[PDB]
Amino acid sequence: TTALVCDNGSGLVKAGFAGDDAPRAVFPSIVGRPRHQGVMVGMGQKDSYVGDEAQSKRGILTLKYPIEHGIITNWDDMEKIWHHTFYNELRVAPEEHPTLLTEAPLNPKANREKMTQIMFETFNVPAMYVAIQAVLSLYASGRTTGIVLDSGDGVTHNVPIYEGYALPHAIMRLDLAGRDLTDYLMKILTERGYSFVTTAEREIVRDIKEKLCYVALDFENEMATAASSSSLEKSYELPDGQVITIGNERFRCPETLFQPSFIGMESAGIHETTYNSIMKCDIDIRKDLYANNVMSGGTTMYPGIADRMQKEITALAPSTMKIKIIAPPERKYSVWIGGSILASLSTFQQMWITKQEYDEAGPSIVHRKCF
Amino acid sequence: KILTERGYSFVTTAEREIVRDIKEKLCYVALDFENEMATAASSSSLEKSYELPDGQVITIGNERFRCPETLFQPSFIGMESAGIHETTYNSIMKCDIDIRKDLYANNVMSGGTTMYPGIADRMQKEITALAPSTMKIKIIAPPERKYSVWIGGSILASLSTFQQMWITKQEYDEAGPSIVHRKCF
C-alpha cells in the first residue's frame, strides 16, 4: 500500500507517489467557469474546467482560486480540485492509498477540520496526515536543524527547528507571496500602458513574473542603472503577438518581499521576519540557525534571491558569525520531495490518522495527532 | 452610378438585374488599388466586354475593380464606417487577448459578396498589414461559400441534440410571440 503526497498549495497543486524523485502531476489550482453564451449545441459543454484545461481555454473563462492565503474559501471548488488530481491526473483510487497533505502554520482550525471531514467522508481514505510544509522542506534538505522560510503563492512563513525540535512561539506567518506580486506587477505594468484586468491576464502577468523578473542585489543602484541606461530592459511576446518591454519592473516586483510597504502592509520584510524568528529562539541554537537558512517554495526561484538573503541577514547578524543560505536548485518541489521522504519513512506508519481513530474521535483528533 | 461615366444609363429596377449580372460576371477585387488604376489608365488590357439582352455590347475598364473596392473603402458611397478588413480586425481587438491567435488562423468568409476572385489575397494583405508580424493570417475561402449558410442549416437540423431546442406550438400558445426572444439568441 504505497502513499500519495498532495501539496495543495495556493497556486500550484503538486501531487505524486511516495519514494519518487520528481512530483508526477504539477498543475495550477484554478476552477474556470464560462462567462459568455454557448451558441454551438452539442460538443459536451462543461460547466467547469479544472486545471490545465482551464489554463488552455482561459480566454472565455472566469478563473477562481479556491485557496486564498492558505485558507480554503470555496469548498466545492476545492472538492473539484481534489477530484481532478485524484481521478484525472494520477488516476488512483484514494480508498486504497494514504494521503499526506501540507498546510501552512497558524491556520484556522476549522479549515483543518474541514479537510479532515472531506478527506475522510468524500474521498475516504485508509489514512491521511496533515503536515507543516517547512518540516518537509527541512526533510528534503536532509539537515535536522535549520530555519525554513517557505514562500508559496499565498503564504510566506518562517519555522525554526533545532535538532529535531520545532519552536512554535518563533513560528511566524506573513500573507505576502506570488499572487500579491502578480497583482502588484499589474499595478506597476499600468505605468507603461499595458492594461490587465481579467482573471485570464493574471496568468500572463504571472508568466511575465516567472520568466523575466529577478531579485536585485542592491535596489537603489539597480534603480539608478535602469533609470540611466536601457540595458536591463527586456522584451516579452504576448499570446496575441504583441511585444511588451519592461525595465525596472523586473526588480520592483520581487522587492515587495523585502519592502512590504509597497502594497501598504505594515509588516517588515522576509529578512526581518527571519531575523526576528531567530531572535525569538533560544540563545544557544542561533549558531546553527544562522548557518542553515533553508529557503523553499516557488517564490524563491528568482536568480538573485540567495545573495540578497545572505546580504540582508549578514547586515542584521553580528559580523563574527557566518551566514549560509541553503538554496537547492529543486527547491520548488522540496515540499513534495520531503513529503515523499516522510511517507517512505518506516517510523511514520504509527502516526497515520486512521479511519477508525477518526470515527472514534470525531474530526477532532487532527488537532492532537498532528502538530 | 459609375456605369453612367462611360455612357451607359440604367435607371429602372429591371436594369438592376443587368447591372447585378455585370457585377457578378466581370468584376474582380484588385490586389493593389493604385497600381491597378495606373495599369487601367495606361493600357486597355483590363477592359472586358459584355452583351446586353437587346444586343448592344458594353466594354468596362477600371469599373471592374472600382465597384468591389467599396467593401474595403466605404467612403465611395459616403458612409462613415470602416472597411471590412478593419471591421474584422476591430472585432478581433474587441475580443479577449488569449483567443486572438485562433481568430487569426480561422478567418472564415461566407456569402456571395466574397465571390470576387481577388478578395482572399487582398484581405490577407490587409490583415497582415494590420496584425503584428509574428502571426499567421489564414483565411478560409471554400468554393461553396455562397450557400454555406444553408449548408450549416442542414448541418444543424441533422443534429440529434437540436431537437429539444425548437419553439413548439404549445409554448407559443402560452407565451405569446415573445418566447422567440428568450429561446433563441
Binding site: T1, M40, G42, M43, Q350 | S154, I155, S158, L159, T161
Partner: peptide, 21 residues
Amino acid sequence: RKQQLAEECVIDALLADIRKG
C-alpha cells in the same frame, strides 16, 4: 498493532452532420 500488521467536441459533431449532408 502487532495483530493489525499480521493482518496486512465541435469537430466530431460537425463532421457527423457534414457526412449526413
